[PDB]
Design a protein around this ligand. Structure first.
Ligand SMILES: CC(/C=C/C=C(C)/C=C/C=C(C)/C=C/[C@H](CCC(C)(C)O)C(C)(C)O)=C\C=C\C=C(C)\C=C\C=C(C)\C=C\C=C(C)\C=C\[C@H](CCC(C)(C)O)C(C)(C)O
Ligand SMILES: CC(/C=C/C=C(C)/C=C/C=C(C)/C=C/[C@H](CCC(C)(C)O)C(C)(C)O)=C\C=C\C=C(C)\C=C\C=C(C)\C=C\C=C(C)\C=C\[C@H](CCC(C)(C)O)C(C)(C)O
Ligand SMILES: CC(/C=C/C=C(C)/C=C/C=C(C)/C=C/[C@H](CCC(C)(C)O)C(C)(C)O)=C\C=C\C=C(C)\C=C\C=C(C)\C=C\C=C(C)\C=C\[C@H](CCC(C)(C)O)C(C)(C)O
Ligand SMILES: CC(C)CCC[C@@H](C)CCC[C@@H](C)CCC[C@@H](C)CCOC[C@@H](CO)OCC[C@H](C)CCC[C@H](C)CCC[C@H](C)CCCC(C)C
Ligand SMILES: CC(C)CCC[C@@H](C)CCC[C@@H](C)CCC[C@@H](C)CCOC[C@@H](CO)OCC[C@H](C)CCC[C@H](C)CCC[C@H](C)CCCC(C)C
Ligand SMILES: CC(C)CCC[C@@H](C)CCC[C@@H](C)CCC[C@@H](C)CCOC[C@@H](CO)OCC[C@H](C)CCC[C@H](C)CCC[C@H](C)CCCC(C)C
Ligand SMILES: CC(C)=CCC/C(C)=C/CC/C(C)=C/CC/C=C(\C)CC/C=C(\C)CCC=C(C)C
Ligand SMILES: *C/C=C(C)/C=C/C=C(C)/C=C/C1=C(C)CCCC1(C)C
Ligand SMILES: *C/C=C(C)/C=C/C=C(C)/C=C/C1=C(C)CCCC1(C)C
Ligand SMILES: *C/C=C(C)/C=C/C=C(C)/C=C/C1=C(C)CCCC1(C)C
Lengths: 234, 234, 234
């Protein structure tokens, strides 16, 4: 595929995974550096949550790079897919943390937060099961199950969180609205890329798909974190 | 075994797993529908916890149905068991949530809740290790270890929780007592079914065992949830 | 290696793993017995956290003993390592609980606790990835990644926690300082033993390495717990 086989193991996508690891590590250390002498109780909570997002993603990217984070799945057809399963390990912790950032900005109640986290975790685990599934009936049923969970996530974000956020100051509202729009646009790309990529129809090859996830991830983690942590809205 | 090989993959138990998935999904969506316009802070907490119970079980059942949620374990004897390991993934999240429902009804302290959840999770993980174990000495030692944890769970329920629940109103007490009795009776069946079924002595075949877990699960999740969520006791 | 092949499966290290299991179980039950009639809210929290530490370790040790908790990893060189991966499952829950004990003694803020737990969990997961990795470049990169996380853990302990602990009474301070010194000394041994043992350079054989982890674990769990739970500092 598109890329460069950095480790001489026949995976040109490692170019994008190695770039991804580097960008996540630089983002992590930049947020740590920025957060270093912050005293405000509220601000340090946003820094703690947000540093761990690209920090966790750094490890997932590095595992994918080295190769332990990819597995072969032999489909009913006999097609062998290379499934980067470490992505789901990453998202299972980072997607709840990103939602937690939004929930803290909105100052929503604890039940809403628990609801969001639970439904989002369900989305990720069912997405992982789908990626590992051997039959096309099972793979697409899971994508559908996970996609429904995603829709509940978007729903609570654009109703419950947004209405809580409405009660805050204009500066908090501005930051919340920008980050919620970034989430609604960027996160929607994931189930689309999955279904057109190697996981699904195979119209996008692994190399391009890996580059595309790397861009979405870095924007969703380091971009989102930069916009959040630079904000007066803390 | 007893059932009907829905997917033509040689597993007659998929009849009961497919029925299980459907019943969990209907229960999930019925609780979501019932909870939709609920405003009371306390009530919505019970709805959030309880919807996720059959929701998580829906996914475990569907994984078992399709087949990814079963694995072959080759015993020291040479007997190959078909172990539905996805059950333990389900119970690890749903059993703590069901206990959390009871702890909220009783209004027990946070230390008691943490204790319950930790011991219950230990029960489930050691049950999973036992199900996957190759030697009869190991399988029965784990069943014993997990059974001891279960006894601590029952113990805290029937002492700490029940004494906290005694302080609430008759209507709260009535609901707590009914659900605690349902837990003490239904949950006790699980280690029994395990030890007489394919996991253990093999006196009950997989088909009947799968139907029996499906009945216990639906009653323990959708039954328990219906009794809880219909209650004034919120 | 050094030891005695208790289960006749060619693993002399099971002598130390069986001793480890017994010592963890006795520690668990001694803390349960000691904690049985304790009413003080604060004290029971320390008992709940601390009993679960050797309780969880009991299960990991027993899994290692029986053999399910060891796996073969075939390195790029062709060397087959026997990796006791169940240790990482243990540490992922027990290391956060031990830190939680220290954080409660110091009465540090909730952000600090979340930070500690997250970084410590990252340390353990990256240590597990390293232990399972096939190439020497990957194994040592992970040891380095995990070691950096460990350094953040030590850092927050010896700055944030210690400065919070300074505000408490002499008796609380004395207990906190003793346990923090035990953590700084004992936990530092783990990455050292890993890099000189089978996981790393192979200068220490598996038998001696298993005995060495058993001593460190029992001291770090039952020793630490005995010093904590005997203390007026609750
Ligand atoms: C493994 C690795 C490094 C991982 C390091 C991590 C994840 C560091 C996390 C630090 C955090 C989250 C800081 C929280 C602070 C908050 C102050 C506090 C209350 C915690 O004292 C602050 C200064 C505001 O960011 C690299 C390879
Ligand atoms: C994947 C799938 C669907 C999963 C959907 C789930 C799990 C929905 C959960 C909704 C919850 C828990 C609602 C909480 C509310 C509480 C209101 C709130 C405070 C959250 O705003 C309410 C209305 C009281 O139930 C199907 C296949
Ligand atoms: C599986 C197995 C046994 C596991 C048993 C466990 C882990 C027991 C935990 C008990 C705890 C943690 C007690 C908390 C109490 C606190 C009182 C409370 C508030 C909970 O009511 C107390 C009395 C202070 O320790 C053996 C093999
Ligand atoms: C590891 C856990 C303790 C953490 C929880 C992860 C969980 C949320 C995700 C489930 C993992 C699941 C997808 C694995 C299933 C893959 C399966 C098909 C088998 C392939 O595995 C092959 C073997 C080596 O030959 O590796 C076996 C590999 C191991 C199963 C684990 C390696 C997984 C990733 C490489 C980890 C990268 C993610 C981050 C490091 C997460 C750490 C964050 C921390 C703060 C919790
Ligand atoms: C998946 C995790 C991130 C979630 C935590 C699960 C954890 C509590 C339970 C441990 C799982 C463990 C029993 C797996 C061990 C099985 C092992 C013998 C190997 C067999 O696995 C084979 C490969 C495919 O060839 O699948 C490999 C399959 C994968 C290991 C995972 C699939 C597990 C189940 C099919 C998942 C169904 C349960 C629900 C979807 C849980 C989601 C709830 C959510 C809110 C967390
Ligand atoms: C089990 C989970 C629900 C709990 C979370 C554990 C998690 C934090 C750690 C990740 C586990 C990961 C290291 C496993 C990767 C090993 C992999 C290379 C494959 C080898 O596995 C082989 C199969 C059997 O043939 O066993 C497959 C074995 C299974 C994957 C699981 C067995 C793991 C250990 C033997 C468990 C011992 C630890 C304690 C029992 C933990 C319980 C504490 C509780 C309160 C949560
Ligand atoms: C390859 C092999 C066959 C499979 C690997 C096994 C994997 C799947 C095991 C991973 C299991 C892991 C995901 C367990 C989940 C753990 C998640 C948590 C412990 C989060 C819970 C944290 C709560 C306890 C915090 C509560 C917060 C309070 C303060 C309100
Ligand atoms: C840092 C990573 C982020 C923000 C990842 C977001 C990922 C998702 C929203 C994944 C969604 C998926 C579905 C809706 C269906 C199945 C495929 C999944 C996991 C990709
Ligand atoms: C929805 C599922 C429920 C309520 C499941 C409950 C399961 C248990 C109480 C399992 C108990 C077990 C033991 C006590 C010993 C080993 C076998 C286990 C897991 C089945
Ligand atoms: C009860 C167990 C305890 C207190 C275990 C502590 C383990 C560690 C501090 C492990 C540290 C490691 C590194 C710093 C690098 C990689 C090897 C690890 C896991 C051993």
């Amino acid at each position: 595929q598109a890329g460069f086989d950095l480790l001489n193991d026949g995976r040109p996508e490692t170019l994008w995974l190695g770039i991804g690891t580097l960008l996540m590590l630089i983002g992590t250390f930049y947020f740590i550096a920025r957060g270093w002498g912050v005293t405000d109780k509220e601000a340090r909570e946003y820094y703690a949550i947000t540093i761990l997002v690209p920090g966790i993603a750094s490890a997932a990217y590095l595992a994918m790079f080295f190769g332990i984070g990819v597995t072969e799945v032999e489909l009913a057809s006999g097609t062998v897919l290379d499934i980067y399963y470490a992505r789901y390990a990453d998202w299972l912790f980072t997607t709840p943390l990103l939602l937690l950032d939004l929930a803290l900005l909105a100052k929503v109640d604890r039940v809403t937060i628990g609801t969001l986290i639970g439904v989002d975790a369900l989305m990720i685990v069912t997405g992982l099961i789908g990626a590992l599934s051997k039959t096309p009936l099972a793979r697409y049923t899971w994508w559908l199950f996970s996609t429904i969970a995603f829709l509940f996530v978007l729903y609570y974000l654009l109703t419950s969180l947004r209405s809580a956020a409405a009660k805050r100051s204009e500066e908090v509202r501005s930051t919340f609205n920008t980050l919620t729009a970034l989430v609604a646009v960027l996160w929607t790309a994931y189930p689309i890329l999955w279904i057109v990529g190697t996981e699904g129809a195979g119209v996008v090859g692994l190399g391009i798909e890996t580059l595309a996830f790397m861009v979405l991830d870095v924007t969703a983690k380091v971009g989102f974190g930069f916009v959040l942590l630079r904000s007066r809205a803390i």
